[PDB]
Design an enzyme around this catalytic site. Structure first.
Site, PDB file in Angstrom:
ATOM      1  N   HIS A 131      54.500 -54.671 -42.149  1.00  0.00           N
ATOM      2  CA  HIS A 131      55.003 -56.028 -41.886  1.00  0.00           C
ATOM      3  C   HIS A 131      56.005 -55.887 -40.745  1.00  0.00           C
ATOM      4  CE1 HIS A 131      57.578 -59.386 -42.141  1.00  0.00           C
ATOM      5  NE2 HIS A 131      56.607 -60.060 -42.804  1.00  0.00           N
ATOM      6  N   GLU A 153      75.046 -50.688 -31.596  1.00  0.00           N
ATOM      7  CA  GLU A 153      76.233 -49.871 -31.320  1.00  0.00           C
ATOM      8  C   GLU A 153      76.176 -48.587 -32.116  1.00  0.00           C
ATOM      9  OE1 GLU A 153      76.889 -53.022 -32.987  1.00  0.00           O
ATOM     10  OE2 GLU A 153      76.345 -53.997 -31.075  1.00  0.00           O
ATOM     11  N   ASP A 183      53.444 -61.677 -35.292  1.00  0.00           N
ATOM     12  CA  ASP A 183      54.713 -62.255 -35.754  1.00  0.00           C
ATOM     13  C   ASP A 183      55.824 -61.307 -35.294  1.00  0.00           C
ATOM     14  OD1 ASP A 183      56.372 -64.002 -37.340  1.00  0.00           O
ATOM     15  OD2 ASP A 183      56.272 -62.569 -38.994  1.00  0.00           O
ATOM     16  N   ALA A 184      56.807 -61.812 -34.582  1.00  0.00           N
ATOM     17  CA  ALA A 184      57.949 -60.991 -34.178  1.00  0.00           C
ATOM     18  C   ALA A 184      58.681 -60.499 -35.423  1.00  0.00           C
ATOM     19  CB  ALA A 184      58.874 -61.740 -33.273  1.00  0.00           C
ATOM     20  N   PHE A 233      42.851 -62.582 -40.974  1.00  0.00           N
ATOM     21  CA  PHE A 233      44.103 -61.883 -40.651  1.00  0.00           C
ATOM     22  C   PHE A 233      43.764 -60.609 -39.897  1.00  0.00           C
ATOM     23  CE2 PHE A 233      48.209 -60.417 -43.215  1.00  0.00           C
ATOM     24  CZ  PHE A 233      48.857 -60.079 -42.059  1.00  0.00           C
ATOM     25  N   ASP A 262      58.862 -57.180 -39.772  1.00  0.00           N
ATOM     26  CA  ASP A 262      60.288 -57.040 -40.145  1.00  0.00           C
ATOM     27  C   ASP A 262      60.540 -55.685 -40.761  1.00  0.00           C
ATOM     28  OD1 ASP A 262      61.122 -59.623 -39.298  1.00  0.00           O
ATOM     29  OD2 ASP A 262      60.662 -60.506 -41.285  1.00  0.00           O
ATOM     30  N   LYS A 263      59.659 -55.256 -41.647  1.00  0.00           N
ATOM     31  CA  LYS A 263      59.811 -53.956 -42.303  1.00  0.00           C
ATOM     32  C   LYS A 263      59.638 -52.831 -41.304  1.00  0.00           C
ATOM     33  CE  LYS A 263      61.597 -54.259 -46.256  1.00  0.00           C
ATOM     34  NZ  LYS A 263      62.704 -53.459 -45.695  1.00  0.00           N
ATOM     35  N   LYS A 287      79.768 -49.588 -43.186  1.00  0.00           N
ATOM     36  CA  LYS A 287      79.297 -50.973 -43.246  1.00  0.00           C
ATOM     37  C   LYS A 287      79.052 -51.284 -44.708  1.00  0.00           C
ATOM     38  CE  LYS A 287      78.619 -50.043 -38.742  1.00  0.00           C
ATOM     39  NZ  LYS A 287      79.211 -48.839 -38.132  1.00  0.00           N
ATOM     40  N   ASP A 316      78.190 -53.887 -46.152  1.00  0.00           N
ATOM     41  CA  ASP A 316      76.944 -54.633 -46.463  1.00  0.00           C
ATOM     42  C   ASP A 316      75.972 -53.739 -47.216  1.00  0.00           C
ATOM     43  OD1 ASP A 316      77.441 -57.158 -45.286  1.00  0.00           O
ATOM     44  OD2 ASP A 316      76.651 -56.481 -43.361  1.00  0.00           O
ATOM     45  N   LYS A 360      72.580 -49.119 -40.659  1.00  0.00           N
ATOM     46  CA  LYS A 360      74.044 -49.083 -40.823  1.00  0.00           C
ATOM     47  C   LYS A 360      74.489 -47.860 -41.614  1.00  0.00           C
ATOM     48  CE  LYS A 360      74.170 -54.205 -41.020  1.00  0.00           C
ATOM     49  NZ  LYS A 360      74.561 -55.352 -41.849  1.00  0.00           N
ATOM     50  N   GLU A 407      70.075 -52.306 -34.572  1.00  0.00           N
ATOM     51  CA  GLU A 407      69.089 -53.366 -34.836  1.00  0.00           C
ATOM     52  C   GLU A 407      67.823 -53.021 -34.070  1.00  0.00           C
ATOM     53  OE1 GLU A 407      70.304 -55.012 -37.038  1.00  0.00           O
ATOM     54  OE2 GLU A 407      72.367 -55.582 -36.634  1.00  0.00           O
ATOM     55  N   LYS A 452      51.495 -58.617 -47.172  1.00  0.00           N
ATOM     56  CA  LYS A 452      52.454 -59.356 -48.009  1.00  0.00           C
ATOM     57  C   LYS A 452      51.825 -59.577 -49.366  1.00  0.00           C
ATOM     58  CE  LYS A 452      55.164 -62.397 -46.020  1.00  0.00           C
ATOM     59  NZ  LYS A 452      55.656 -63.628 -45.347  1.00  0.00           N
ATOM     60  N   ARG A 511      65.658 -58.956 -41.970  1.00  0.00           N
ATOM     61  CA  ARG A 511      64.979 -60.229 -42.234  1.00  0.00           C
ATOM     62  C   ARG A 511      64.154 -60.181 -43.516  1.00  0.00           C
ATOM     63  NH1 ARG A 511      64.619 -64.223 -37.956  1.00  0.00           N
ATOM     64  NH2 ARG A 511      62.781 -64.827 -39.118  1.00  0.00           N
ATOM     65  N   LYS A 512      64.362 -59.140 -44.319  1.00  0.00           N
ATOM     66  CA  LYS A 512      63.684 -58.994 -45.639  1.00  0.00           C
ATOM     67  C   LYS A 512      64.719 -58.631 -46.700  1.00  0.00           C
ATOM     68  CE  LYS A 512      59.615 -60.444 -44.836  1.00  0.00           C
ATOM     69  NZ  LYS A 512      60.345 -61.334 -43.931  1.00  0.00           N
TER      70      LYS A 512
HETATM   71  C1  SAM Z   1      82.453 -55.908 -37.592  1.00  0.00           C
HETATM   72  S1  SAM Z   1      80.981 -56.395 -36.657  1.00  0.00           S
HETATM   73  C2  SAM Z   1      79.603 -55.374 -37.504  1.00  0.00           C
HETATM   74  C3  SAM Z   1      79.725 -53.848 -37.327  1.00  0.00           C
HETATM   75  C4  SAM Z   1      79.541 -53.444 -35.848  1.00  0.00           C
HETATM   76  N1  SAM Z   1      78.106 -53.617 -35.448  1.00  0.00           N
HETATM   77  C5  SAM Z   1      79.895 -51.990 -35.612  1.00  0.00           C
HETATM   78  O1  SAM Z   1      79.373 -51.440 -34.615  1.00  0.00           O
HETATM   79  O2  SAM Z   1      80.778 -51.461 -36.339  1.00  0.00           O
HETATM   80  C6  SAM Z   1      80.493 -57.936 -37.392  1.00  0.00           C
HETATM   81  C7  SAM Z   1      81.191 -59.159 -36.879  1.00  0.00           C
HETATM   82  O3  SAM Z   1      82.610 -58.956 -37.062  1.00  0.00           O
HETATM   83  C8  SAM Z   1      83.302 -59.576 -35.974  1.00  0.00           C
HETATM   84  N2  SAM Z   1      84.065 -58.583 -35.224  1.00  0.00           N
HETATM   85  C9  SAM Z   1      83.721 -57.941 -34.060  1.00  0.00           C
HETATM   86  N3  SAM Z   1      84.668 -57.168 -33.594  1.00  0.00           N
HETATM   87  C10 SAM Z   1      85.698 -57.359 -34.495  1.00  0.00           C
HETATM   88  C11 SAM Z   1      87.013 -56.848 -34.522  1.00  0.00           C
HETATM   89  N4  SAM Z   1      87.532 -56.036 -33.594  1.00  0.00           N
HETATM   90  N5  SAM Z   1      87.797 -57.249 -35.533  1.00  0.00           N
HETATM   91  C12 SAM Z   1      87.316 -58.064 -36.457  1.00  0.00           C
HETATM   92  N6  SAM Z   1      86.109 -58.602 -36.543  1.00  0.00           N
HETATM   93  C13 SAM Z   1      85.349 -58.201 -35.515  1.00  0.00           C
HETATM   94  C14 SAM Z   1      82.263 -60.327 -35.150  1.00  0.00           C
HETATM   95  O4  SAM Z   1      82.129 -61.635 -35.667  1.00  0.00           O
HETATM   96  C15 SAM Z   1      81.032 -59.465 -35.391  1.00  0.00           C
HETATM   97  O5  SAM Z   1      79.834 -60.200 -35.142  1.00  0.00           O
HETATM   98  C1  SAM Z   2      52.709 -66.156 -41.275  1.00  0.00           C
HETATM   99  S1  SAM Z   2      53.732 -65.098 -40.186  1.00  0.00           S
HETATM  100  C2  SAM Z   2      55.212 -66.255 -39.795  1.00  0.00           C
HETATM  101  C3  SAM Z   2      54.855 -67.480 -38.938  1.00  0.00           C
HETATM  102  C4  SAM Z   2      54.417 -67.063 -37.516  1.00  0.00           C
HETATM  103  N1  SAM Z   2      55.594 -66.523 -36.729  1.00  0.00           N
HETATM  104  C5  SAM Z   2      53.823 -68.221 -36.726  1.00  0.00           C
HETATM  105  O1  SAM Z   2      53.843 -68.122 -35.474  1.00  0.00           O
HETATM  106  O2  SAM Z   2      53.244 -69.121 -37.361  1.00  0.00           O
HETATM  107  C6  SAM Z   2      54.642 -64.097 -41.334  1.00  0.00           C
HETATM  108  C7  SAM Z   2      53.934 -62.873 -41.835  1.00  0.00           C
HETATM  109  O3  SAM Z   2      52.681 -63.299 -42.432  1.00  0.00           O
HETATM  110  C8  SAM Z   2      51.698 -62.293 -42.178  1.00  0.00           C
HETATM  111  N2  SAM Z   2      50.603 -62.849 -41.396  1.00  0.00           N
HETATM  112  C9  SAM Z   2      50.379 -62.762 -40.048  1.00  0.00           C
HETATM  113  N3  SAM Z   2      49.245 -63.305 -39.664  1.00  0.00           N
HETATM  114  C10 SAM Z   2      48.681 -63.713 -40.864  1.00  0.00           C
HETATM  115  C11 SAM Z   2      47.429 -64.315 -41.137  1.00  0.00           C
HETATM  116  N4  SAM Z   2      46.497 -64.608 -40.213  1.00  0.00           N
HETATM  117  N5  SAM Z   2      47.147 -64.566 -42.424  1.00  0.00           N
HETATM  118  C12 SAM Z   2      48.054 -64.283 -43.352  1.00  0.00           C
HETATM  119  N6  SAM Z   2      49.249 -63.738 -43.208  1.00  0.00           N
HETATM  120  C13 SAM Z   2      49.498 -63.461 -41.928  1.00  0.00           C
HETATM  121  C14 SAM Z   2      52.409 -61.115 -41.524  1.00  0.00           C
HETATM  122  O4  SAM Z   2      52.880 -60.256 -42.531  1.00  0.00           O
HETATM  123  C15 SAM Z   2      53.540 -61.830 -40.786  1.00  0.00           C
HETATM  124  O5  SAM Z   2      54.636 -60.958 -40.511  1.00  0.00           O
END
Ligand code: SAM
Ligand code: SAM
Ligand code: XRH
Lengths: 380, 380
Positions: free
Chosen positions: A14, A55, A243-244, A235, A16-17, A274, A276, A270, A42, A166, A249-250
């Site tokens: 998938h 980063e 699909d991007a 499919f 996202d995965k 982090k 999260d 992460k 990311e 899926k 996103r999961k």
């Molecule tokens: C802390 S950053 C996530 C971790 C980061 N990607 C890293 O490299 O450590 C998440 C969000 O916190 C905020 N943030 C960024 N720099 C920060 C800082 N110096 N102090 C506090 N919050 C910050 C921003 O809103 C950012 O999108």
């Molecule tokens: C349906 S797509 C999301 C919507 C899509 N971005 C669009 O442009 O309509 C989400 C996920 O469904 C699955 N998918 C992609 N094409 C498909 C198809 N023809 N039939 C069923 N599932 C599909 C894939 O796992 C994909 O990542």
């Protein structure tokens, strides 16, 4: 008193995965050389493209081209016929150092145990006694259906399968004093990318006989069960071409399939600072420790942090009515038994170990006896 | 029987929220010309870069350079000193048509009311009577703190502010027969990007006196309230330069701040046929209709779909013990009063209207009397 509940899962291909797995392949590559790497990687995927954005501050020397392509190869995208090929795709890198302003506020010149949270945020842990592994049946079954598709693709049983899939499982439950008991499977969805030659009837028959019946106990399936197998009808286009994909996103597939609650943070890409990820893993460990300790049948744990502050700002417990002890009493047991500072969680859960790509498909919880799945023996 | 609960919000210039607003600016630009545009626009942001990735099939002619840069201008990133500038950033586009395999399975040659769900998935709606708008107080206050920062930035009151901010509010609650009643604010976090000249003490004083006291009623603040104001100590680097952003990475900020439940789907960048958005909006509308109709004090609604199938696979109701009616009876009232096919939701909620950028900061729910916030009068 019966109700329906639905969870989904997605396969290793998938889009996202794919991104979660690549982000964690990058994290693991860094941690293999620098256990203290600061990683926030990311991944974005679309036709022909993996982009890394984020980063990283690390002493490691990582070959991103190799790490990304090996991850895509493992997933199974190895030919233009499948819509994506690790050998020939574009790998683009937009990676910079960690912000020095974050570094100075989080970890610079701090004792490890007293490292600040790497961000603010909220995180939840959940456990339920309906399965031995303390997971909801809906999500366990959804994950296993994707795993079964990958197994039959890889063993050449169903060579028309591609990696993008899926699944979705709806279970009818009964309630027993706030605990939940699965009765039957009400509906199953499976959608999986396939080759240009196999027909719909061949796929639907195989998905019912070789996938569903292999995974789901017959006692849960009956004449009423509804099957939506290849419900789109076609499919062939799949993976990032269909699909991007993006990292993180999961997050509901990664956790409890909709049960419990979620604080919003993504896990993959992460390092432990982090919260999260580390605090969600610790909250799972707490929840599972309460259920395996016999204090409740199911439980939700919230924790929260401020960036730069080590101790959690809040800790909360919801037992759904499934404990003789009050939530106050359970919160006191948690506070007496757990230290949820990130610089302590890292030691208890061994979170510098490069095992993160293994977490990035089929859910982070309920599998493989990771440290957060081994309950702590509680004193009270 | 008191407990803590924490929710966060982020500002318009948080890098994830930048991406949600750009995705929805693109959606709105398409819908202005083609109400039936099929849009799946993901945005990624890092230093100097907005990338659009995804799938759009539309009769519109959209100038992506203009739409992206105008969205960034509105947020306030207009100079290299602030870390990002709409005039000079890179805008990269990796947009293709919608997969023909999705199109044929979802909407091709279908009557609009009988269009298939654009994907499988699960979605939740929630409502709580603790505020007039039927939202949790923790998330309302968190959003209003970010809105206040943007107001004082834009009116030149606090000209050291930059657009990137985060807030977090922990409330102490009491329970009343499954309903929840806020008592006091236990902890507030505010982190906001700032200029190189202003000192920490000036910022902390302003955040307490001009932000918190302007937003949070004094009756909730006392001698015990904990304040974490600029807790990292320094936040000059911010926006995408400090942290990569992606669409759909604030799904809990977008919804209920951790209360209720979430099915995992992102809202921004998607037209109505993507049930991640339309069915979550409809589930909010159902939940709010149950609470404003006097049937429960708080309620959670689940719905789920299969790609290509119009009717939901499942509908479920959890009333937290706050109704005299059983959840079965509430589910029968829902089924008698609502039609949750996407091709009916679009008509009830007017989901071809280009108002989506307005939803993409400060939460999608509890504000501005959007159609999903206007309760339906229930017959039973
Ligand atoms: C802390 S950053 C996530 C971790 C980061 N990607 C890293 O490299 O450590 C998440 C969000 O916190 C905020 N943030 C960024 N720099 C920060 C800082 N110096 N102090 C506090 N919050 C910050 C921003 O809103 C950012 O999108
Ligand atoms: C349906 S797509 C999301 C919507 C899509 N971005 C669009 O442009 O309509 C989400 C996920 O469904 C699955 N998918 C992609 N094409 C498909 C198809 N023809 N039939 C069923 N599932 C599909 C894939 O796992 C994909 O990542
Ligand atoms: C103590 N007090 C009053 C607290 N109240 C709170 O709401 N939360 C709280 C806050 C934020 C989020 C959640 N998230 C969920 O617990 C609700 O979540 C879910 C999710 C998925 C399924 C269910 N759920 C289900 O589990 N059972 C069902 N049965 C058994 C009928 C059910 C039926 C239908 C449906 Cl649609 C859902 C059902 C329920 C809860 C607290 C959290 C804490 Cl840490 C501490 C105290 C409280």
């Amino acid at each position: 008193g019966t109700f329906l509940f639905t969870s989904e899962s997605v396969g290793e291909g998938h889009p996202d995965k794919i991104c979660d797995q690549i982000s964690d392949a990058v994290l693991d590559a860094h941690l293999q050389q620098d256990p203290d790497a600061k990683v926030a990687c990311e991944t974005v995927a679309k036709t022909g493209m993996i982009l890394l954005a984020g980063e990283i501050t690390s002493r490691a020397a990582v070959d991103y081209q190799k790490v990304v392509r090996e991850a895509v190869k493992h997933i199974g995208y190895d030919d233009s016929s499948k819509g994506f090929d690790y050998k020939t795709c574009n790998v683009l890198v937009a990676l910079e150092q960690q912000s020095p302003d974050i570094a100075q506020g989080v970890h610079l010149d701090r004792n490890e145990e007293d490292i600040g949270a790497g961000d603010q945020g909220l995180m939840f842990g959940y456990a339920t006694d309906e399965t031995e592994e303390c997971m909801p049946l809906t999500i366990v079954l959804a994950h296993k259906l994707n795993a079964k598709l990958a197994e039959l693709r890889r063993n050449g049983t169903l060579p028309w399968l591609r990696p993008d899939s899926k699944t979705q499982v709806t279970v009818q439950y009964m309630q027993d004093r706030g605990a939940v008991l699965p009765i039957r499977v009400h509906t199953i969805v499976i959608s999986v990318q396939h080759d240009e030659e196999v027909c719909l009837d061949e796929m639907r028959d195989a998905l019912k006989e070789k996938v569903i019946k292999a995974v789901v106990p017959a006692k849960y399936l009956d004449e009423d069960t509804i099957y939506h197998l290849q419900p789109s009808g076609r499919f062939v286009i799949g993976g990032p071409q269909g699909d991007a994909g993006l990292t993180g996103r999961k997050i509901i597939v990664d956790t409890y399939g909709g049960w419990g609650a979620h604080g919003g943070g993504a896990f993959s890409g992460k390092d432990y600072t982090k919260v999260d990820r580390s605090a969600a893993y610790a909250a799972r460990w707490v929840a599972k420790s309460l259920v395996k300790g016999g204090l409740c049948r199911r439980v939700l744990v919230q924790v929260s942090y401020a960036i730069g502050v080590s101790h959690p700002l809040s800790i909360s417990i919801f037992h759904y009515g499934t404990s003789q002890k009050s939530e106050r009493e359970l919160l006191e047991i948690v506070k007496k038994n757990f230290d949820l500072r990130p610089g302590v969680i890292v030691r208890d859960l061994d979170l510098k170990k490069p095992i993160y790509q293994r977490t990035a498909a089929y859910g982070h919880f309920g599998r493989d006896s990771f440290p957060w799945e081994v309950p702590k023996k509680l004193k009270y």
